[PDB]
Amino acid sequence: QESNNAAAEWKYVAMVMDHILLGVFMLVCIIGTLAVFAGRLIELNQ
Amino acid sequence: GLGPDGQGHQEIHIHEGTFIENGQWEIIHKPSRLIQPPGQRQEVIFYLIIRRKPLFYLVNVIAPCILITLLAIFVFYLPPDAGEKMGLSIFALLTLTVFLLLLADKVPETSLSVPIIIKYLMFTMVLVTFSVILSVVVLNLHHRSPHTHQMPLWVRQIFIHKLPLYLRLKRP
Amino acid sequence: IRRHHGGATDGPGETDVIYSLIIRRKPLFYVINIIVPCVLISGLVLLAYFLPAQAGGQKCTVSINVLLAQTVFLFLIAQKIPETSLSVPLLGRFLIFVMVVATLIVMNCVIVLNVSQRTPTTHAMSPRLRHVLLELLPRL
Amino acid sequence: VDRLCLFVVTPVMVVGTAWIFLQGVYNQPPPQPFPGDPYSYNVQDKRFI
Amino acid sequence: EQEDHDALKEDWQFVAMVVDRLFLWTFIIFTSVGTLVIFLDATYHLPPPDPFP
Amino acid sequence: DWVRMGNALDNICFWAALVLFSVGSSLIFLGAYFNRVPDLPYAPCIQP
Amino acid sequence: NVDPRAPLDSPSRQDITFYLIIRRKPLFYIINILVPCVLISFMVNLVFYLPADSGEKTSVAISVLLAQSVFLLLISKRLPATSMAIPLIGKFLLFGMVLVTMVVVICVIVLNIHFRTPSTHVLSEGVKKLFLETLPELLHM
Amino acid sequence: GTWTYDGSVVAINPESDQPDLSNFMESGEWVIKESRGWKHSVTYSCCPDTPYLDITYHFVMQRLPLYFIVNVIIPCLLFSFLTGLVFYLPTDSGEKMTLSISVLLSLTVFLLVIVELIPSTSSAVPLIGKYMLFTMVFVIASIIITVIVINTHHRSPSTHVMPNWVRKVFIDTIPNI
Amino acid sequence: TLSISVLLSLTVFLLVIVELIPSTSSAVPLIGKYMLFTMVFVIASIIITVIVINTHHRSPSTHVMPNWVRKVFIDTIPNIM
Numbered sequence: 001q002e003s004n005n006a007a008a009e010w011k012y013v014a015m016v017m018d019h020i021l022l023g024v025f026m027l028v029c030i031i032g033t034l035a036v037f038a039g040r041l042i043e044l045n046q
Numbered sequence: 047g048l049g050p051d052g053q054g055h056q057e058i059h060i061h062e063g064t065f066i067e068n069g070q071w072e073i074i075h076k077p078s079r080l081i082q083p084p085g086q087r088q089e090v091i092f093y094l095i096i097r098r099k100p101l102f103y104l105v106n107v108i109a110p111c112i113l114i115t116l117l118a119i120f121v122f123y124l125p126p127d128a129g130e131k132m133g134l135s136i137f138a139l140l141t142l143t144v145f146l147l148l149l150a151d152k153v154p155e156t157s158l159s160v161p162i163i164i165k166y167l168m169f170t171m172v173l174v175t176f177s178v179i180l181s182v183v184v185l186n187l188h189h190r191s192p193h194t195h196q197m198p199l200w201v202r203q204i205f206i207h208k209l210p211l212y213l214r215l216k217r218p
Numbered sequence: 219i220r221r222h223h224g225g226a227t228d229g230p231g232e233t234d235v236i237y238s239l240i241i242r243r244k245p246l247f248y249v250i251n252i253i254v255p256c257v258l259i260s261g262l263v264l265l266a267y268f269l270p271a272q273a274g275g276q277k278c279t280v281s282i283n284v285l286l287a288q289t290v291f292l293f294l295i296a297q298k299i300p301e302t303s304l305s306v307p308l309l310g311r312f313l314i315f316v317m318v319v320a321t322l323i324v325m326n327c328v329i330v331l332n333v334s335q336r337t338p339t340t341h342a343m344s345p346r347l348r349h350v351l352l353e354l355l356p357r358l
Numbered sequence: 359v360d361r362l363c364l365f366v367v368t369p370v371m372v373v374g375t376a377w378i379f380l381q382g383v384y385n386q387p388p389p390q391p392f393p394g395d396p397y398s399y400n401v402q403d404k405r406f407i
Numbered sequence: 408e409q410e411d412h413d414a415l416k417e418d419w420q421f422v423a424m425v426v427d428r429l430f431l432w433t434f435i436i437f438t439s440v441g442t443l444v445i446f447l448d449a450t451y452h453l454p455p456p457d458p459f460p
Numbered sequence: 461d462w463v464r465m466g467n468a469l470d471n472i473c474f475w476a477a478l479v480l481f482s483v484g485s486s487l488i489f490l491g492a493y494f495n496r497v498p499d500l501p502y503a504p505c506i507q508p
Numbered sequence: 509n510v511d512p513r514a515p516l517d518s519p520s521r522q523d524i525t526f527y528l529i530i531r532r533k534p535l536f537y538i539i540n541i542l543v544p545c546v547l548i549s550f551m552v553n554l555v556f557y558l559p560a561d562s563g564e565k566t567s568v569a570i571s572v573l574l575a576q577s578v579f580l581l582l583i584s585k586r587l588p589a590t591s592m593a594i595p596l597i598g599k600f601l602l603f604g605m606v607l608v609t610m611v612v613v614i615c616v617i618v619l620n621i622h623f624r625t626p627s628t629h630v631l632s633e634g635v636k637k638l639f640l641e642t643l644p645e646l647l648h649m
Numbered sequence: 650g651t652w653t654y655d656g657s658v659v660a661i662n663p664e665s666d667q668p669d670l671s672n673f674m675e676s677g678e679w680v681i682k683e684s685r686g687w688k689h690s691v692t693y694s695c696c697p698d699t700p701y702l703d704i705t706y707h708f709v710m711q712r713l714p715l716y717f718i719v720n721v722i723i724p725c726l727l728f729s730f731l732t733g734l735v736f737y738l739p740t741d742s743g744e745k746m747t748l749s750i751s752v753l754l755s756l757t758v759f760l761l762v763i764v765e766l767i768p769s770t771s772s773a774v775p776l777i778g779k780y781m782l783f784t785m786v787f788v789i790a791s792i793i794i795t796v797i798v799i800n801t802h803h804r805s806p807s808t809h810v811m812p813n814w815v816r817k818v819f820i821d822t823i824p825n826i
Numbered sequence: 827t828l829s830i831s832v833l834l835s836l837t838v839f840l841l842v843i844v845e846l847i848p849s850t851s852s853a854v855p856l857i858g859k860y861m862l863f864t865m866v867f868v869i870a871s872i873i874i875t876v877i878v879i880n881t882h883h884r885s886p887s888t889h890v891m892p893n894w895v896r897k898v899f900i901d902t903i904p905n906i907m
């Protein structure tokens with residue numbers, strides 16, 4: 001039981017890292033898309 | 047040029063027993079018209095209206111994509127414990143990408159409109175992408191545990207009691 | 219301007235004008251589209267050693283699929299490289315080196331899985347290798 | 359269920375493959391170049407006047 | 408305690424199964440509608456009955 | 461104990477393969493620096 | 509060839525036509541495409557023999573489907589897109605892909621059955637008798 | 650311009666300041682936004698008497714991007730979206746690496762597709778090429794991070810006890826941040 | 827996964843090799859014979875791997891092992907080395 005709990009602590013830490021990384025990467029996707037396209041999209045609009 | 051009877055047979059003449067029949071295109075209408083000027087010059091315009099015979103693309107593109115879509119549906123019937131759900135869904139997407147590589151040699155490069163087959167391929171890719179996303183959601187739900195999450199009352203109510211009755215599922 | 223001797227019969231000479239265009243390739247296109255992708259893909263192979271040699275691990279999966287990706291690049295690269303046999307391109311040497319290293323990593327992953335998946339019902343542990351791996355290596 | 363589906367599908371696969379490939383293999387040009395013409399047009403059958 | 412943990416895990420797995428069935432049904436519906444619309448549009452595209460309408 | 465031996469093998473082989481890859485790739489790419497166009501007595505084709 | 513209907517002054521009335529009836533030498537294609545395509549397609553029969561506990565049954569079938577897709581990409585570039593008939597190798601590819609899809613579906617059903625539990629499904633006594641006594645006896649399991 | 654005749658011998662003049670576009674067949678790929686023709690008369694240091702004439706027509710063409718958008722951007726967008734999704738897949742599934750690497754494979758195959766479409770110019774990086782490189786690097790980074798997370802999840806407390814700083818950050822603060 | 831990915835890579839490489847090999851059907855090229863050898867070798871390896879995996883997952887639910895298999899693989903072979 002002690003060993004399983006100690007391993008589950010690492011599993012929980014990995015899950016929290018997973019959540020943070022999911023949020024960061026899903027933000028980075030749109031950040032990069034806008035960063036590359038928006039300049040020329042504005043230029044062609046204006 | 048008039049017809050052999052002297053009638054205004056304004057048509058492309060085709061020797062019916064000598065014409066070399068094209069394997070992909072069928073000639074439907076073949077008229078001609080004299081065009082009057084609006085330096086003015088007249089024009090004689092001959093019109094070929096031809097329908098594409100689609101069997102090649104039916105066999106080599108559409109049916110494979112139908113099969114891939116059918117497999118992408120059955121992704122949801124695979125139990126989460128099998129551990130092959132991502133493999134199946136992404137390999138289906140890869141096969142669709144290979145068939146997209148096939149079709150890219152065939153499609154016109156003009157950007158005035160989108161071919162219906164390209165719309166169909168993009169719709170199928172969207173379907174496979176959503177199948178992947180929903181399979182990831184299902185697998186996320188499957189591996190939740192009291193060591194990591196506490197199920198809220200609304201999830202318990204809806205999914206354990208309400209939806210099974212609609213889906214004709216019953217918990218043993 | 220070149221002047222050439224005639225034949226051994228002392229025939230009339232000949233004259234040529236030769237211009238030598240020494241030209242240099244702009245490498246940017248291949249660095250972006252081929253070199254950097256292949257370098258990063260080959261770097262991905264070294265990540266396999268951090269995948270646990272345990273059930274659910276995907277060490278061989280990663281290594282073999284990275285090798286398949288490198289074979290797809292080999293298809294892509296072979297469209298660009300000319301077919302002459304006088305020498306091997308630097309990009310080709312790098313590609314072959316990467317593929318050889320990837321096969322070595324596949325072999326190492328297979329060896330490590332064969333070590334980790336052993337059981338007392340099948341293998342008697344050698345005490346020398348046990349001491350070396352568990353004691354001598356940490357002490358080294 | 360696995361063995362049942364094996365015994366169902368495998369002979370279907372084999373029979374279909376054989377039916378396709380044997381239909382292909384026995385495709386041969388007709389012994390006369392024009393069907394309905396008995397002449398061979400071969401160099402051995404010199405059709406003297 | 409292990410039995411209670413297993414009961415909670417089974418609850419989560421049942422939720423997952425119900426969600427999987429709901430996704431299966433919704434995906435069937437979306438696929439059938441989209442494919443039917445596309446094929447109907449492709450099929451109704453007959454050649455014109457008149458070269459100069 | 462077998463798992464621990466496997467982990468030790470992984471840990472040593474990681475560093476071995478990393479060094480091998482880094483050295484080989486660096487030495488392969490290094491030729492790009494040395495084989496630039498040589499300096500020659502000829503004037504540049506396009507004047508400044 | 510003399511066309512009796514064409515006017516004597518028409519250019520189409522007479523011609524001399526030389527014909528070539530030529531048979532393809534198949535050995536190159538047999539070695540390079542057909543044998544690989546058939547062998548890879550027949551690989552799918554092993555999926556039924558592969559145990560479910562390996563967790564690799566769908567992988568084989570879907571990868572063979574991918575390989576058949578690659579072969580279809582290769583072959584379709586070598587022939588004109590006519591509608592007169594499907595080429596023999598095209599018929600074989602279509603039939604093989606249909607069977608591979610069917611085997612994928614069958615494998616998904618088999619795996620769904622394998623991981624069933626009394627926490628999620630009820631194994632009826634009639635089903636037990638049918639699939640553990642009668643059918644294995646018929647199949648010589 | 651006249652190749653061998655100079656402006657003191659043959660003079661060329663534009664008929665109109667713009668090219669005649671009245672017969673222009675509508676292009677399916679480019680839109681001519683504007684056009685003009687300018688006459689130029691350069692003089693060289695040998696000869697003030699002999700100007701050399703040319704007429705330079707020019708066309709400002711803007712591409713219709715819809716073909717490239719549909720046939721490149723959408724699949725790349727799908728791959729980019731699936732790239733981040735892996736972090737929602739639990740490690741216990743045992744499929745995070747399969748997902749990430751198979752996405753990478755699909756992206757490589759689509760790169761093999763892309764090379765047929767995009768220009769092989771080396772003068773400057775295309776915007777589409779920059780986006781492709783961005784997507785590839787994003788996939789690679791996601792794979793690296795997934796490997797790190799997997800190595801964290803399966804870590805054994807027998808050899809690696811959790812240090813107090815990792816506990817106090819991730820267990821305590823992160824879910825309460 | 828390993829054997830199937832090797833087969834996939836070999837097929838992707840065949841996709842590149844078929845266009846380089848001459849289509850002259852008078853005789854098989856030596857490289858073509860080598861490719862056929864490699865393909866058949868991979869296929870046989872996959873078949874035998876499936877047989878071995880099926881063997882491994884057997885249990886007493888499959889009923890008793892035949893005594894000759896025990897005599898060969900459990901007794902004889904490990905004593906021969």
Ligand SMILES: *[C@@H]1O[C@H](CO)[C@@H](O[C@@H]2O[C@H](CO)[C@@H](O[C@@H]3O[C@H](CO[C@H]4O[C@H](CO)[C@@H](O)[C@H](O[C@H]5O[C@H](CO)[C@@H](O)[C@H](O)[C@@H]5O)[C@@H]4O)[C@@H](O)[C@H](O[C@H]4O[C@H](CO)[C@@H](O)[C@H](O)[C@@H]4O[C@@H]4O[C@H](CO)[C@@H](O)[C@H](O)[C@H]4NC(C)=O)[C@@H]3O)[C@H](O)[C@H]2NC(C)=O)[C@H](O)[C@H]1NC(C)=O
Nearest residue numbers: 063387388390391392393394395509510511512525527529
């Ligand atoms: C490779 O390709 C080449 C072409 O690229 C193929 O060559 C063709 O071969 C076929 C098979 O023989 C040829 O078809 C036959 O042609 C002859 C010649 O006809 C012409 O000459 C006649 C006088 O010289 C003239 O009467 C004919 O007019 C007839 O045909 C035209 C065309 O449609 C009609 O408009 C007319 O009204 C008229 O019918 C023409 O100028 C024909 O005699 C022959 O006709 C027989 O067969 C037809 C079906 O095959 C029947 O419908 C006919 O009624 C007729 O019937 C036949 O009569 C024979 C005499 O009694 C009898 O012995 C025979 O049994 C009987 N058959 C039947 C089925 O009843 C037919 O049209 C074709 O013209 C060739 N084309 C060329 C040379 O350009 C070659 O075969 C290919 N090789 C392969 C595949 O291996």
Ligand SMILES: *[C@@H]1O[C@H](CO)[C@@H](O[C@@H]2O[C@H](CO)[C@@H](O[C@@H]3O[C@H](CO[C@H]4O[C@H](CO)[C@@H](O)[C@H](O)[C@@H]4O)[C@@H](O)[C@H](O)[C@@H]3O)[C@H](O)[C@H]2NC(C)=O)[C@H](O)[C@H]1NC(C)=O
Nearest residue numbers: 075079081082083084091093095454455456457458459460
């Ligand atoms: C295939 O493409 C052809 C052209 O590429 C199509 O031909 C077009 O067909 C339409 C339908 O009939 C015509 O439109 C008609 O044109 C006449 C004549 O217009 C001229 O004269 C009037 C004065 O009478 C003048 O105002 C115009 O400017 C023209 O000088 C009109 O009287 C009708 O109202 C109507 O507009 C097109 O003119 C015709 N184009 C050509 C170039 O012939 C053909 O229809 C297409 N076929 C199919 C099946 O789609």
